[PDB]
Amino acid sequence: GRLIYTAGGYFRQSLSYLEAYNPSNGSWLRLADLQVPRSGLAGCVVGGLLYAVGGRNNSPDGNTDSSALDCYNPMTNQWSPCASMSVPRNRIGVGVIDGHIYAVGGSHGCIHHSSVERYEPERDEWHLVAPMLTRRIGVGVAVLNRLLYAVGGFDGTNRLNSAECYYPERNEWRMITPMNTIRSGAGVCVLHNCIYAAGGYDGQDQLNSVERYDVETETWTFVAPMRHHRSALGITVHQGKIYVLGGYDGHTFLDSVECYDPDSDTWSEVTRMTSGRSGVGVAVTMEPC
Ligand SMILES: CCC[C@@H]1CCCCN1C(=O)c1cccc(-c2cccc(-n3ncc(C(=O)O)c3C3CC3)c2)c1F
Ligand SMILES: [Cl-]
């Protein structure tokens, strides 16, 4: 079976937790801690390995933005460092295309990045690619049909409803239709032919709303809202269903995990994380041993 891995996050300070949830039986497993606490990171999987990318260690002894890439092997339950990115990237978004990891946007202190870089596991090397048209931190990233989408975020001055697409063979970014909602620190993922954007912060309030972009019609449509308003949520897809994990609702660091069934257009509570946290990294891969 395949598990939903949550890495890092934030509650009082940045966290080192790695925990795995099994939708088939409801169980949570605590696995090997990250070597360095981090929130505002992203997770992804390549070749069955789990990668934790970017973030920041918010800690009583100082705050340090992360350029780190670290690899977790479920076969061994061990974290291994990989090559670091060109720059620290807190509140990062990532996407995988053709076995390569794209790191998108994020912050380094007051620097809000438009830059983008690509990691090649076989070479353990990062290389910069074309920058986005917009500086974006708290950016949602997804991949559909081997194209990379950057959705919403914060540009240093304003939260954004805008979104853009990267065409790898042209090394070029182009704007797409903006969302109907300003969203920073949303969860963004792909399901079927659609890019979903769930929650986020609009400048005044945390959001429960969810909308999706159909690449064939170039339009965004709202679907059913989540049960919990949330920003800095984790999101992933497991067996054709969207899962959202944790985040902040303006009041509480949520332990709520919700899942979306596109066929019934309904959200339901599925489990609680072992403790409330925001700004996790999430991805799906095989069971450990
Ligand atoms: C010291 C951190 C406090 C912070 C902010 C105030 C509320 C308590 N805190 C969090 O819960 C938190 C902690 C770590 C990371 C994140 C995190 C993750 C991804 C994206 C963004 N992100 N990126 C742009 C924006 C924006 O506001 O436009 C955000 C916030 C709307 C989410 C933020 C956290 F939110
Ligand atoms: Cl932060």
UniProtKB/Swiss-Prot annotation:
Effect of altering R91A?
A: Impaired interaction with SQSTM1/p62. Abolished interaction with SQSTM1/p62
Result, substituting R159M = Impaired interaction with NFE2L2/NRF2
Q: Where is this gene product found? A: Cytoplasm; Nucleus
User: Where is the chain membrane-spanning?
Assistant: none
Deletion phenotype, per the entry, is: Early postnatal lethality caused by abnormal cornification. Mice survive until weaning and probably die from malnutrition resulting from hyperkeratosis in the esophagus and forestomach that cause gastric obstruction. Defects are caused by constitutive activation Nfe2l2/Nrf2, leading to constitutive expression of phase 2 detoxifying enzymes. Mice lacking both Nfe2l2/Nrf2 and Keap1 reverse the hyperkeratosis phenotype and are healthy and viable in normal conditions.
Site location (Sensor for electrophilic agents): C110
The name under which this protein is listed is Kelch-like ECH-associated protein 1
Report the source organism.
Answer: Mus musculus (Mouse)
- What are the top taxonomic ranks of the organism? Eukaryota, Metazoa, Chordata, Craniata, Vertebrata
- Measured against the full-length protein, the chain present covers 325 to 613 of 624
